[PDB]
Write a protein that binds this DNA or RNA. Structure first.
Length: 276
DNA sequence: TCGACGGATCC
DNA sequence: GCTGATGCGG
DNA sequence: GGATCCGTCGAACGCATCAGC
């Protein structure tokens, strides 16, 4: 079925106005995304922080348009060590962070440009492009090792400051999180291994799935659709892009959105409103 | 994702 | 720059 | 033996690299 995201709630559970708007977008090709007008949409969304995944663009090749952003002038990027048109993330912020770091501090998992950590006054923001398990599940063994190192890293982070994690986590947690769960139980993104790890991630850190916390029974809300088979026109998709929050931020949570109608990738953007 | 393939298994 | 083939992705 | 179940098998879309020139 087709999905309509409800209007933005911009007041917190205590009536306080949202002060921080974070948008996250797996652009799947930063340069093509910009050519497909992605930055225009960004300028109208006007986030305070913009997190990008699957940029597929080395630092040298960053399009000129990106410095034309004066509302997101503090920009951080991470590309793979050696694979050239692969993976990649970026973090653009209105205000300068206190401290920015790349990767999770584990050599094996910090070579594919997947993680940026940005520390702000009252929280830490992580954006991540989690490794796909791969066609025929060839990288599933590696993915399970990623899941554990990433969980352990995030647990340490969240022990020192409240944590926001966003981006393409490359799993649909539960059957409500994709249109065809039955046919996908042996495909990347919906293996029991990947689903288990996501559950362990929520419990171990701990983290809450912002969108599920507010809309725990809302079906057909997805963030990705294959380019093939006209999937997006039929809303045959997966919810792969999340905002995961420390529990102590839940009273700061105003809304967690899915921007279904913004085009330019095979993912749509998602947006978090917090009252900090 | 989808429909074409098998190879069982059924009124 | 242009073709044609390969890597990758849920 | 002619339908109807199943689990496989394959090739689409899009971006970006690579090889070669």
């Amino acid at each position: 079925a087709l999905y309509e995201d409800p209007p933005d709630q911009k007041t917190s559970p205590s009536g306080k106005p949202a002060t921080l708007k974070i948008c996250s977008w797996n652009v799947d090709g930063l340069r093509a995304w910009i050519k497909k007008k992605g930055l225009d949409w960004v300028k109208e969304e006007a986030p305070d922080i913009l997190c990008l995944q699957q940029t597929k663009c080395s630092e040298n090749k960053l399009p000129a348009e990106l410095q034309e952003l004066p509302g997101l002038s503090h920009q951080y990027w991470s590309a793979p060590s050696d694979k050239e048109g692969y993976s990649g993330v970026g973090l653009l912020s209105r205000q300068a962070p206190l401290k920015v770091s790349y990767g999770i501090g584990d050599e094996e998992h910090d070579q594919e440009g997947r993680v940026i950590v940005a520390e702000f006054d009252s929280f830490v923001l992580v954006t991540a492009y989690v490794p796909n398990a791969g066609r025929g599940l060839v990288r599933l063994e590696y993915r399970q090792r990623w899941d554990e190192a990433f969980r352990k890293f995030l647990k340490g982070l969240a022990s020192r400051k409240p944590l926001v994690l966003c981006g393409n986590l490359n799993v649909a947690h539960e059957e409500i999180d994709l249109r065809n769960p039955k046919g996908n139980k042996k495909n990347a993104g919906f293996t029991p291994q990947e689903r288990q790890g996501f559950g362990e991630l929520l419990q171990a850190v701990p983290l809450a799935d912002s969108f599920r916390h507010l809309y725990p029974n809302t079906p057909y809300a997805y963030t990705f659709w294959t380019y093939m088979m006209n999937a997006r026109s039929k809303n045959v998709g997966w919810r792969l892009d999340y905002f995961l929050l420390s529990h102590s931020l839940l009273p700061a949570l105003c809304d967690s959105k899915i921007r279904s109608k913004a085009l330019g990738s095979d993912h749509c953007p998602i947006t978090l409103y917090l009252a900090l």
